[PDB]
Amino acid sequence: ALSPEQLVLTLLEAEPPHVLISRPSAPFTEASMMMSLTKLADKELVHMISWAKKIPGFVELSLFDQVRLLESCWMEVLMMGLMWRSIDHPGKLIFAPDLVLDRDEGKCVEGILEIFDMLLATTSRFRELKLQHKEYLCVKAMILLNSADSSRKLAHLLNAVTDALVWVIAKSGISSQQQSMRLANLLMLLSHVRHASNKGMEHLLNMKCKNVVPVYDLLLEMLNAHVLRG
């Protein structure tokens, strides 16, 4: 039972810290770029779990629901983050402050370029809409949450975060109609993010089985998504 203004601040406080990784000394190859990505991701996944647990009410869901939600949305959340980080840097993908990939660098890994392009396209769209930080916080949480006691609780949590986004938009002062248009515009983009994550997951699974990159521990568990698949 918390107001939207209060939930936004809570989300702000829950934001994961920046993961610092750097380009390898030697130039990139398919294998080393992928390696860097998996190393970055494993650290980010750890942070994602901590973030999730700071979302009011999340830990009250069934453990089964908590696992399924994270297993289904993780790549999408990682991508949403990457989009935010890259928002003011056209043509670039800011995976990490010191790991900034240029679009063309996608050529280093077979089939990643078209996905990078998808990523840059959606990022461009968010930039043109002038996505605000607080809006991003709400949307990111929305991605996790939109992915009987526990069901009831989840629906309530999704509603809370939705209400927060509505609140954030309303403080901009624009007309009711433009507020609605903005909201729709943002949510509509979300399907583009989901799409990118679907292609990213497919691609990553390929990279793994083509033994281009080794996938272990937390990343592997989440990628396999055994609990989610049942």
Partner: peptide, 8 residues
């Protein structure tokens, strides 16, 4: 481990 981390 995702399990350990959530149960934590």
């Amino acid at each position: 481990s995702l399990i350990d981390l959530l149960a934590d």
